[PDB]
Amino acid sequence: MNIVITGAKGFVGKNLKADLTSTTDHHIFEVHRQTKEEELESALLKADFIVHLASLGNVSYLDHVLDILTRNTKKPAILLSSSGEQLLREYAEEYGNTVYIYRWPNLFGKWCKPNYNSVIATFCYKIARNEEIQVNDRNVELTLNYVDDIVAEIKRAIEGTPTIENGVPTVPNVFKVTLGEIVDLLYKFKQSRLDRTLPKLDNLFEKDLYSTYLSYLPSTDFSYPLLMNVDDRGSFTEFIKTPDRGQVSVNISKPGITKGNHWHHTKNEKFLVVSGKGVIRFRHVNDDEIIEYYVSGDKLEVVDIPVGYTHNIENLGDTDMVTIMWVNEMFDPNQPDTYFLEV
Amino acid sequence: MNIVITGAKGFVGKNLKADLTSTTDHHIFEVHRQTKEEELESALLKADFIVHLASLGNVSYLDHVLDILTRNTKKPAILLSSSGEQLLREYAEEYGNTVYIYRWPNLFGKWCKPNYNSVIATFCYKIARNEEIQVNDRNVELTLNYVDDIVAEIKRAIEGTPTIENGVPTVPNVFKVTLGEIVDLLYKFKQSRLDRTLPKLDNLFEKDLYSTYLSYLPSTDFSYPLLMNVDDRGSFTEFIKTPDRGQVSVNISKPGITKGNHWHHTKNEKFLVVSGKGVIRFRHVNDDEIIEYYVSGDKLEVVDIPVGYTHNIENLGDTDMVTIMWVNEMFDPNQPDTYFLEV
Ligand SMILES: [Zn+2]
Ligand SMILES: [Zn+2]
């Protein structure tokens, strides 16, 4: 299908275009402010669908586009957002085009311009760069659609099946969050480089907000150092922490090194040797028997570390053993729940 | 302090003992059914604290113990659970001992006997071994204390500061869960070896139940295989998945291998190279500039993979590169949100 996109250089425009060239075989005709009149007319005359994203006689850009479409024999469909609706209804009646009229709320997502009156864009950009932000009123209710919903809704429309809610085409998943919640979320995401915590990804708004925030990071600033606890035996490094799904860390043991020899009451772990080779050993606290699990990066398998078994880990190889360690709780030096016991 | 523990071989007994020898300097005197009368008397006569866990003339074991304590000059404190209380009150009045009287509900935790009328113990044991279980009524309300609370409460009592709730010493954190919830939890924990999901660790009951379940695993059965997706370029293996904190996986690239060259709308990642050395590269979808991040296991640092940047990963070393990959969502082959783009 020949699809034209007006205001192609805008926020939604770039998002839709990128998506449309990647996931469909439609020919996309982009039009914008520097498009020549001969190129605009040619596009609208061969279009099958028009996504419109853009008094002394001066006619609006919109009306100019509608008057040109007047001469497209194929009565192509027209999609747009209201923010003069009655005018568009009359255009559809007279010329025959199905024209989907949406009323989008405020938007957010990647590629929106910072410091040009989209308050979310500005906040992400500034917070990622440690810049003083202005919060006029934390209690202001926002009505938002994420960019992915807009884009996904437009594609439903392109195939003749748009979401209708009470007479009008309506993009699903609108959010209502106050400004304070947004700012707090933003600062929390930045803090998470320091404390290794993760966002609440089953909160749709938050997950959407986290992705959009990342997109505003300076290009020199994608990575952050981890705190390696290094000594002559190897290193132990925390990676991610969570209050509800435990935490993962990296243990590196040099050749011939044994670590552990402790047991836990309630703390438990999952060991994944991803490089090198060695043995994970267990003895029940009240018992004689030593049980050995020989493991290596050659064959990825998790060893659960059940409660009440003392356990140790040894490198048997002539290179460093690296083990991914999941633990069921964030470690607390007050209540370590770890008791030294050999074997 | 000299502390004696009656019924030392029981469920709580073994737990308390293990804990007490590990975390205090008190001398623990264990007494049980095969303790000789000369050894019982010697213990109670030198005791500072007694943790009691155990008609034609026959006197109960409890009364025997109380009559012996009658001759301990030091008026030692006595702790026990009611399930003949008025009898104990009268003993304290006459002989002077502070006697803490608890009323424990049903218990659960490691080292409780399976198939001896503790229904939770039995279920864990059977489910871990793929054994037909009997569920008489899923809707039966249980009143439970975890073993760690019992043990922690006893130690508060040993130091003269027990938790009092409305006149009585009361162990905190009692649970009310139906049998159906328990069984469902148990089967879910066993299923999680197959689907790599984790329990809800901020649910205190569930976290307590998960630890207790692990403790019943056969000793040959601590580990489970992971599904490695192997080919000539390396391997990709899922490790843990969650609906709210994303998932972690292991990518292994052989020397000179490049993987990636895609971008995402909303999916984002965290790359941790834990072994080998190479480069993670980024180009903004609408842009010329290639940004390179040189990384190695020699220095653990996370690289965030922001949305809207195409990205690839290359091994530069003469050995395998292993990268831990965190992603903000479980992968869904219907909505993969990943679009091929070079560079
Ligand atoms: Zn451990
Ligand atoms: Zn990716």
Distance separating alpha carbons of residues B322 and B303, to the nearest angstrom: 14
- Residue A235 has phi, psi (to 5 degrees) of -160, 150
Counts of helices then strands in chain B (DSSP H, E): 8, 22
Name the helix (H) or strand (E) containing A205: helix A204-214
Residues A105 and A144: beta-carbon distance below 8 Å: yes
Q: SS3 letters for A164-199?
A: EECCEECCCCCEEEEHHHHHHHHHHHHHHHHHCECC
Q: Does domain B225-343 have CATH number 2.60.120.10?
A: yes
Distance separating alpha carbons of residues B62 and A179, to the nearest angstrom: 65
Ligand number nearest to the C-alpha of B264: 2
Residues A193 and A224: beta-carbon distance below 8 Å: yes
Nearest to A304 among B222, B285, B339 (CB): B222
Distance separating alpha carbons of residues A100 and B38, to the nearest angstrom: 94
| B-chain residues near A222 (CB < 8 A) | 282, 291, 293, 303-306
Min Cα separation B9/chain A (Å): 11
Q: Could you tell me the distance, in angstroms and rounded to a whole number, from the CA of residue B250 to the centre of ligand 2?
A: 13
| B-chain residues near A311 (CB < 8 A) | none
A324 vs B328: CB contact, 8 Å cut-off?
no
CA terminus-to-terminus distance, chain A: 70
Q: Could you tell me the distance, in angstroms and rounded to a whole number, from the CA of residue A118 to the centre of ligand 2?
A: 28
Residue B245 CB contacts under 8 Å (≥ 6 apart), including other chains: A198, A200, A201, A240, A242, A244, A245
Q: Does domain A2-224 have CATH number 3.30.465.10?
A: no
Q: Which residue in chain B has the smallest CA separation from A326?
A: B240
Which residues in chain B are classed under CATH 3.40.50.720?
2-224
Residues B217 and B186: beta-carbon distance below 8 Å: no
Min Cα separation A4/chain B (Å): 19
Question: Which residue has 């002394």 as its token pair?
Answer: A56
Nearest to B201 among A245, A248, A293 (CB): A245
Among B16, B251, B275, B289, pick the best mutation site for testing chain A contact (most A Cβ within 10 A).
B275
Experimental method: X-ray
A72 class by beta-carbon count within 10 Å (0-12 exposed, 13-18 middle, 19+ buried): middle
Ligand number nearest to the C-alpha of A303: 1
Amino acid code (one letter) for A331? F
Residues B52 and B62: beta-carbon distance below 8 Å: yes
| B-chain residues near A253 (CB < 8 A) | none
B266 vs A211: CB contact, 8 Å cut-off?
yes
Q: Which residue in chain A has the smallest CA separation from B290?
A: A219
In three-state secondary structure terms, B255 is coil
Q: Which residue in chain B has the smallest CA separation from A207?
A: B328
A300 vs B250: CB contact, 8 Å cut-off?
yes
Helices assigned H by DSSP within B215-292: none
Amino acid code (one letter) for A212? T
B208 vs A266: CB contact, 8 Å cut-off?
yes
A118 class by beta-carbon count within 10 Å (0-12 exposed, 13-18 middle, 19+ buried): middle
B201 vs A111: CB contact, 8 Å cut-off?
no
| A-chain residues near B306 (CB < 8 A) | 214-215, 217, 222
Min Cα separation B2/chain A (Å): 21
Report which DSSP code applies to A129.
T
Residues B4 and B51: beta-carbon distance below 8 Å: yes
Nearest in space to B241 (alpha carbons), one of B328, B304, B336, B323? B328
A253: which strand partners? A234, A321
Report which DSSP code applies to B8.
T
Among A307, A315, A329, A340, pick the best mutation site for testing chain B contact (most B Cβ within 10 A).
A307
Give the dihedral of Cα atoms A210, A211, A215, A218; nearest 10 deg: 40
A188 class by beta-carbon count within 10 Å (0-12 exposed, 13-18 middle, 19+ buried): middle
Q: Could you tell me the distance, in angstroms and rounded to a whole number, from the CA of residue A264 to the centre of ligand 1?
A: 6
Distance separating alpha carbons of residues A72 and A4, to the nearest angstrom: 13
Tokens read off for B92: 């304290």
| CB environment A215-238: b (16+ within 10 A), e (fewer) | bbbeeeebbeebebeeeeebbbbb
Helices assigned H by DSSP within chain B: 11-23, 37-46, 61-69, 85-95, 119-128, 147-158, 179-195, 204-214
CA terminus-to-terminus distance, chain B: 70
Tokens read off for B220: 């040959």
Q: How far is CA B251 from CA A152, A295, B233, B324, in A?
A: 31, 18, 10, 6
Residues A311 and A285: beta-carbon distance below 8 Å: no
- Residue B197 has phi, psi (to 5 degrees) of -85, 165
Among B192, B214, B230, pick the best mutation site for testing chain A contact (most A Cβ within 10 A).
B214
Specify the pairing of strand A106-108 against strand A141-146.
parallel
Please give the full DSSP string across B107-150, using - where no structure is assigned.
Answer: EE-TTPPTTSS-HHHHHHHHHHTT-----S-TT-EEEEEEHHHH
Among B25, B245, B321, pick the best mutation site for testing chain A contact (most A Cβ within 10 A).
B245
Which residues in chain B are classed under CATH 2.60.120.10?
225-343
Distance separating alpha carbons of residues B239 and A274, to the nearest angstrom: 11
Nearest to A302 among B226, B268, B320 (CB): B226
A266 vs B148: CB contact, 8 Å cut-off?
yes
Distance separating alpha carbons of residues A125 and A228, to the nearest angstrom: 30
- Residue B289 has phi, psi (to 5 degrees) of -75, 125
Min Cα separation A189/chain B (Å): 12
Distance separating alpha carbons of residues B151 and B12, to the nearest angstrom: 7
Nearest to A328 among B201, B228, B301 (CB): B201
Min Cα separation B259/chain A (Å): 19
Amino acid code (one letter) for B16? L
Question: Which residue has 């054994």 as its token pair?
Answer: B131
Tokens read off for B207: 């976290």
Q: Could you tell me the distance, in angstroms and rounded to a whole number, from the CA of residue A269 to the centre of ligand 1?
A: 6
Nearest in space to B269 (alpha carbons), one of B207, B335, B337? B337
Name the helix (H) or strand (E) containing A104: none
Tokens read off for B201: 């660790």
Q: Could you tell me the distance, in angstroms and rounded to a whole number, from the CA of residue A268 to the centre of ligand 1?
A: 6
Distance separating alpha carbons of residues B196 and A243, to the nearest angstrom: 18
Q: Could you tell me the distance, in angstroms and rounded to a whole number, from the CA of residue A1 to the centre of ligand 2?
A: 29
Question: Which residue has 């180009």 as its token pair?
Answer: B283
A286 vs B207: CB contact, 8 Å cut-off?
no
A210 vs B328: CB contact, 8 Å cut-off?
yes
Nearest in space to A332 (alpha carbons), one of A246, A234, A250? A246
Nearest in space to A323 (alpha carbons), one of A271, A285, A267, A246? A271
Nearest in space to A276 (alpha carbons), one of A315, A248, A246? A315
| A-chain residues near B247 (CB < 8 A) | none
| B-chain residues near A210 (CB < 8 A) | 268, 328
